[PDB]
């Protein structure tokens, strides 16, 4: 584990991360997709062999020796708010189990269900709080990746508030 486990946020493409493994914001069918998923497919295409997994789960596939944890958040256009909330929390709990199993000291993670699976709603606080609930008990350094300047500031404020 990291000597003093931390959370950090960076506003850049997760495909350029400086961590020991990456979490993909995957679709259930293991398709190239859009947004984070498409960037992950371009950088680590080998990790999409048998990466299909149900909503609310995570499945890791190696690209060489680099782990890609495919985490499937719910698409809020299809799920009710109640059921989608439960599946989003579940996907993050599965990411925490995979990060622990892998023994990594750091992990790059996006905010699940905040892009095209958001159902047109701002889910920064919802998704980030489920990320914290799952990852707080792990000892890996977590680096959250985002692309919006206002989201970077809000994620950074939420991290600093708890220290």
Min separation Cβ 106 and Cl ion, Å: 19
Reading across the β-sheet that carries 106-110, which strands appear in turn? Answer: 7-11, 141-146, 106-110, 22-25, 66-71, 58-63
Q: Coil, helix or strand for 65? A: coil
Min separation Cβ 148 and Cl ion, Å: 4
Report H helices in 17-113: 36-43, 81-102
With CB under 5 A as the contact rule, the residue among 128, 131, 146, 155 that binds Cl ion is: 146
Size of the site for Cl ion (CB under 5 A): 8
With CB under 5 A as the contact rule, the residue among 117, 126, 128, 144 that binds Cl ion is: 117
Distance, CA of 144 to chain centre: 8
With CB under 5 A as the contact rule, the residue among 5, 8, 10, 13 that binds Cl ion is: 13
| 145 in a labelled binding site | no
Using CB under 5 A as the binding rule, whether residue 147 contacts Cl ion is answered as yes
Q: Are strands 7-11 and 106-110 parallel, antiparallel or unpaired?
A: unpaired
CA distance 91 to 157: 24
Q: Which residues here bind Cl ion, judged by CB under 5 A?
A: 12-13, 115, 117, 146-148, 151
Please report, in range form, the residues annotated as the binding site for ADP-D-ribose.
13, 27, 35, 115-117
């Amino acid at each position: 584990g990291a000597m003093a486990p931390s959370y950090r946020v960076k506003r850049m493409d997760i495909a350029k991360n400086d961590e020991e493994c990456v979490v993909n914001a995957a679709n259930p069918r293991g398709l190239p997709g859009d947004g984070v998923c498409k960037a992950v497919y371009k950088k680590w295409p080998e990790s999409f062999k048998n990466s299909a997994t149900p909503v609310g789960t995570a499945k890791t596939v190696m690209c060489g020796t680099y782990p890609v944890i495919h985490a499937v958040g719910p698409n809020f256009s299809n799920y009710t708010e109640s059921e989608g909330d439960r599946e989003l929390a579940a996907a993050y709990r599965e990411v925490a189990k995979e990060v622990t199993r892998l023994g990594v000291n750091s992990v790059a993670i996006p905010l699940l269900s905040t892009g095209v699976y958001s159902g047109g709603k701002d889910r920064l606080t919802q998704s980030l709080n489920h990320l914290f609930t799952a990852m707080d008990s792990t000892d890996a350094d977590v680096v959250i990746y985002c692309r919006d300047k206002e989201w970077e500031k809000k994620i950074s404020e939420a991290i600093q508030m708890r220290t």
